[PDB]
Structures are given as structure tokens and as C-alpha cells.
Structure 1
Amino acid sequence: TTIQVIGAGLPRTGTNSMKKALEIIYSKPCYHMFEIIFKKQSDISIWQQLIDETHKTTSDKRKIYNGLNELLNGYIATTDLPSCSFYKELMTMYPNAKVLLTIRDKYDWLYSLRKVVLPKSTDPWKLKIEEGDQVLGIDSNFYKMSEDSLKFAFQKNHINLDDDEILLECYDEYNRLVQEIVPPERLLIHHLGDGWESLCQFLNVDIPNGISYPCANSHHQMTQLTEQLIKHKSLDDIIHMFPGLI
């Protein structure tokens, strides 16, 4: 088992649906932030170490390659933060792996990002997200790793995360650089709604017979999850309300 597909798309661009789609195609696990949050919170400090390594004057690329290889052992693919921020390193480690860039309208993306992943620090909803996350054992260590991974993706040290104009241009910039760095024959750009056919051709497989392309992880559902985590204080007690999410 080795990485076949490197997902370079940013959070809220359909990465969880792509994760599920790749697991359907290959019948092997794909990495995603949900793997960290719901299955392996122990990985948070490992990711934090790697991102930190990138902030050294002279970063040790072999330390990073080895960390990545450790983290992704047994996975056939990667999507979402924090792995997407390392797509260049992943490309080097796995020269035969193809690259996917999931993408969507930037304004739709920002609204989705604000409601689920990166609320403004002035948003009361941020406190609700944090309360719900405590139920899952998710705390400041997680938030620091995820924010750091985003800043690493965007290649910014000091950045005002609360500024929508900065995020919007960072988003466009990120997507543009992926297209300029990855050779076109090694890259598929997948827009929301594109479904199986460009993906499957790209990966040299048939369209899965009678299996629909996944449509997962909407902001409405994530808002509901937060609301129910706060209300019932137990993931196990509410997971029947969220089929196919985790």
C-alpha cells in the first residue's frame, strides 16, 4: 500500500467527498482531517512537529519526508488539511502519484470556511464550535495545528486570518500555484459537481456501476453536528443522526 493520489484541494472544496470517492475506487483508506479528528488525535502533535520543521531557517526535508511516510502508512491517498499543504513534498516522495485539485467558487468557499473551519475571532459561533469540539476531545492543540497548516499552505507568517479579502486572494493564489507547479498531465482539476467521469478517466478506472458520487460534509450538517454535540454531550449518543459522515 502506497500513496496513489495526492489531494491538493483546500478544506471546504469537497475533500471529504473526494476521500470517500477514492476509498470507493481503491477499496483502501484515504487520509483527511476527519481521520485526525475522529480516529487518530494522536497524530496532531506529529503534524505540528512537521509544520514547525518548515518554519526553521534550514528545514530538514528528509525529516519531513520520513514524518509524512509515517503518518500516511496504510493509506492509498490523501486529501484536505493538513496533508494538502505538503503536496510538493508528497509529489517528490511519490513520483508516480497523481495530483487532484478540488476547487469551487471562491465566495462560496469562504462562507463555507467561515461557518465550519475558520470563523472570525469576533464570531460568537466560534465559541459554539469550540464547545462542541470539547465533547470530541478537540482543543487548542488541534486549532493551532490546523491554523498553522493553513498558513503553511498560504505561505504566510503574519497573516490576518480575520480579513476576508486576504483569505480570498490567498485561496486564488494557492489554486493558481498548484496549476503552475504540477505538470498538467499529472493534475486533474475537479470542480464541485463534476462527479465520477473526469476522475475515473484520470485514474484509469471505470465509473463505479450504480454507486453515486459522494455528497458529504455540508455546512448545514456540520452546524447540526455542533448543535447536537453541545446538546447531548456525546458523539456516540448522536451519531445515528449523521449517517455517512464519519
Structure 2
Amino acid sequence: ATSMKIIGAGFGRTGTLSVKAALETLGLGPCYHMLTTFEEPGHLRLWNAVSRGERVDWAEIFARYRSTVDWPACDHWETLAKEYPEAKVLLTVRDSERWYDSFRQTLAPLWSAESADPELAEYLDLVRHITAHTFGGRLDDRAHAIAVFEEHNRRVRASIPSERLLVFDVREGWEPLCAFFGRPVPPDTPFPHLNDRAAFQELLSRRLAHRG
């Protein structure tokens, strides 16, 4: 069977696309990511149902996945860790000021957009929901967004038994990730460094064009 082994609790802009690539290389995928929501039909509607508080069977989202990182799932780490008690929790972190610059320059413009494109309505509803419930409706307030990031990270660390949680900065490379799961380090392989910008812009254009 396909079993969920890793719940990613880190926010976007903490290297989650790189971690997705790394986990899949280690045989711990398929790994879910924000980008996956655009590749799985029905999944943005499922995530908005989750966001509204509907009863949603998590298997309808994750049955084919062994790991998840990034939004939208990272906001639901607490429920997911109870759903999947044998899964580890992976918290990716980053220094807060640089995290916010990354968030403000890449995600906030997308999340704050108005679009007349019907194909983006489900996505915008979802990231507006995240803006509302995780950020209290404000993305432009630097100190506030940083306070949300730091409290999110702290609440994960306070809530998950220590042996079940890895706190990881992607700048550390393979070694602590591999050691935590007891897997070998891939030889002569740099840790992935995926910017997670242009890939999403391509998925947006594919969705507007109805490609795939």
C-alpha cells in the first residue's frame, strides 16, 4: 500500500520544492506540493472544502502520496499528524527576514491578485483562505507576517513529540535529512536548489490554456 510517511509543516519559501525533489530521490515520494494541486483534478476544490471545515477524507487527497510539503497541507500539520500517527513531521525553516522577502516577492503578489480568469478562481479562493486564517488577512505587514511564520514554527515544535519531528534548513544539505530517516546519502549529488518561481508560472499558463 501507499502510506503517508512525512508530513511537511514548513511554510512555502523554505525550500519545499527542493525537499520534494530530495524526498522523491530517497524513495519517500510521491511528495505532494503546492504545484501538485494544479496537476491533480479536483484537488483545489477538495482543499477549499477542507478550508471551509467540511468533513473531507484525507485519502481523497493523499492516497497516492508518501509525503507532503508546502501549502496548503502545512497549515493542517496538527490534524494530519493525528490522522497519520506513524508519519514523521518535517519542519523546514529559514531566517525570518529573508523568508519574508522571498514570500513577499514571489507568493504575495499571486495571492493578492484579482483575476478575471475563471480557471484561477478555485486557486485564488484557496490562497485567500490561507491569507485569512493563517495571516489574519494581511500579507504586506512585514513584522506581522514574520510573527506568523515564527509562531507557526514554534507551535509545531511545541506540539509534536521531539522524536517525531525534524527541524531542517535546506542549507544543511542531505546529511541531517538522510540521518533522520535512516537512509543513505546519495553520493556525489548536490542537494536540490529549486527556486520555485518559474515552474508555477508555467502551471498557471497551462491551466489558463487548458493544457494537459
What is the TM-score when the length of structure 1 is the normalising length? 0.75
Q: What code does the residue aligned with 1:45 have?
A: R
Report whether the alignment pairs 1:73 with 2:63.
yes
8 Å Cα contact 2:10-2:69 kept in structure 1: yes
Deviations 1:140-172 (A, max 9, x none): 3201202313544x3x6x532332221111111
In the alignment, the residues of structure 1 paired with residue 146 and residue 67 of structure 2 have an alpha-carbon distance, to the nearest angstrom, of 27
In the alignment, the residues of structure 1 paired with residue 110 and residue 5 of structure 2 have an alpha-carbon distance, to the nearest angstrom, of 36
Shift of 1:18: 0.6
C-alpha spacing 1:172/1:27, structure 2 compared with 1 (3 Å)? closer
Instruction: Give the secondary-structure state (helix, strand or coil) at the position aligned to 1:139.
Output: helix
Please list, as runs of the form range in 1=range in 2, the aligned pairs for 1:74-93 lying within 5 A after superposition: 74-93=64-83
Larger Rg: 1
Report whether the alignment pairs 1:162 with 2:140.
yes
In the alignment, the residues of structure 2 paired with residue 117 and residue 79 of structure 1 have an alpha-carbon distance, to the nearest angstrom, of 16
Shift of 1:95: 0.8
Please list, as runs of the form range in 1=range in 2, the aligned pairs for 1:69-218 lying within 5 A after superposition: 69-119=59-109, 126=113, 138-152=119-133, 154=134, 158-218=136-196
Q: What code does the residue aligned with 1:47 have?
A: W
8 Å Cα contact 2:6-2:66 kept in structure 1: yes
In the alignment, the residues of structure 2 paired with residue 147 and residue 19 of structure 1 have an alpha-carbon distance, to the nearest angstrom, of 24
Which position in structure 1 is the counterpart of 2:49?
Answer: 49
Aligned Cα root-mean-square deviation (Å) = 2.8
8 Å Cα contact 1:81-1:150 kept in structure 2: no
Shift of 1:213: 1.4
Q: Where in structure 1 are there 5+ consecutive unaligned residues?
A: 54-59, 237-246
In the alignment, the residues of structure 2 paired with residue 84 and residue 208 of structure 1 have an alpha-carbon distance, to the nearest angstrom, of 27
What is the TM-score when the length of structure 2 is the normalising length? 0.86
In the alignment, the residues of structure 2 paired with residue 203 and residue 121 of structure 1 have an alpha-carbon distance, to the nearest angstrom, of 34
In the alignment, the residues of structure 2 paired with residue 121 and residue 73 of structure 1 have an alpha-carbon distance, to the nearest angstrom, of 28
Q: What code does the residue aligned with 1:44 have?
A: L
Shift of 1:110: 1.0
Q: What code does the residue aligned with 2:142 have?
A: D
In the alignment, the residues of structure 2 paired with residue 120 and residue 73 of structure 1 have an alpha-carbon distance, to the nearest angstrom, of 29
Please list, as runs of the form range in 1=range in 2, the aligned pairs for 1:10-21 lying within 5 A after superposition: 10-21=11-22
In the alignment, the residues of structure 1 paired with residue 4 and residue 47 of structure 2 have an alpha-carbon distance, to the nearest angstrom, of 18
Which position in structure 2 is the counterpart of 1:9?
Answer: 10
Q: What code does the residue aligned with 1:26 have?
A: G
Shift of 1:218: 4.8
In the alignment, the residues of structure 1 paired with residue 74 and residue 131 of structure 2 have an alpha-carbon distance, to the nearest angstrom, of 9
Stretches of 4+ moved more than 4 A in 1? 233-236
Q: What code does the residue aligned with 1:169 have?
A: A
8 Å Cα contact 2:7-2:77 kept in structure 1: yes
8 Å Cα contact 1:47-1:145 kept in structure 2: yes
8 Å Cα contact 1:106-1:168 kept in structure 2: yes
Instruction: Give the secondary-structure state (helix, strand or coil) at the position aligned to 2:191.
Output: coil
Moved more, 75-84 or 23-32: 23-32
Shift of 1:234: 6.8
